[PDB]
XYZ file of C-alpha atoms in Angstrom:
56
model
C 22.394 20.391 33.375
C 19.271 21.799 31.279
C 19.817 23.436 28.360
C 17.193 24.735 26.363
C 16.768 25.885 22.576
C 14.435 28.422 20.835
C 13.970 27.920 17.122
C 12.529 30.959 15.786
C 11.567 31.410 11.755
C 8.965 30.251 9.068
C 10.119 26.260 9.237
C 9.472 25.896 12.900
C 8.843 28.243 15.889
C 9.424 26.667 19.487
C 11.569 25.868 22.325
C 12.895 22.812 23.407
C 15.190 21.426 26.406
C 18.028 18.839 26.933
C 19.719 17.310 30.166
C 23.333 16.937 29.342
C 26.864 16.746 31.222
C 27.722 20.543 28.817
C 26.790 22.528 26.779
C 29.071 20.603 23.661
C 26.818 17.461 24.206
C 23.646 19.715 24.287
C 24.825 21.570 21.336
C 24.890 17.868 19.300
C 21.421 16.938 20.600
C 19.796 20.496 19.449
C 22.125 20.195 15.986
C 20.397 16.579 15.149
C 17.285 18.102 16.296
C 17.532 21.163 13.826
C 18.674 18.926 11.037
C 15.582 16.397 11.400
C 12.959 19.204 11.687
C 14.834 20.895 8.397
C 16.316 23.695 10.471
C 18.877 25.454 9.862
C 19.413 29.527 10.351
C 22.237 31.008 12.554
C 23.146 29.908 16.049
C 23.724 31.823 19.303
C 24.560 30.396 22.597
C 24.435 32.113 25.776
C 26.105 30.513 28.791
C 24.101 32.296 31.195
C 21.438 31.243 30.379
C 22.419 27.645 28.767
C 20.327 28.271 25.826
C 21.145 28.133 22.011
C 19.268 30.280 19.819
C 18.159 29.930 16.172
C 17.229 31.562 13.292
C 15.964 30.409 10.680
């Protein structure tokens, strides 16, 4: 399934997509994302729409 993630803030604006079997796997993709691009802010997910949101 595709899951997608916005980043929104002053470190990195953008929005980037995963395939995984749920949203738990996507969720560890987008986290090691964050943490490489020195991300960090507060996380939302919405299931309806498979995507995790963050603020910086």
């Amino acid at each position: 399934t595709t899951y997608k993630l916005i980043l929104n803030g002053k470190t990195l604006k953008g929005e980037t997509t995963t395939e995984a079997v749920d949203a738990e796997t996507a969720e560890r993709v987008f986290k090691e994302y964050a943490k490489k691009n020195g991300v960090d802010g507060e996380w939302t997910y919405d299931d309806a729409t498979k995507t995790f949101t963050v603020t910086e």
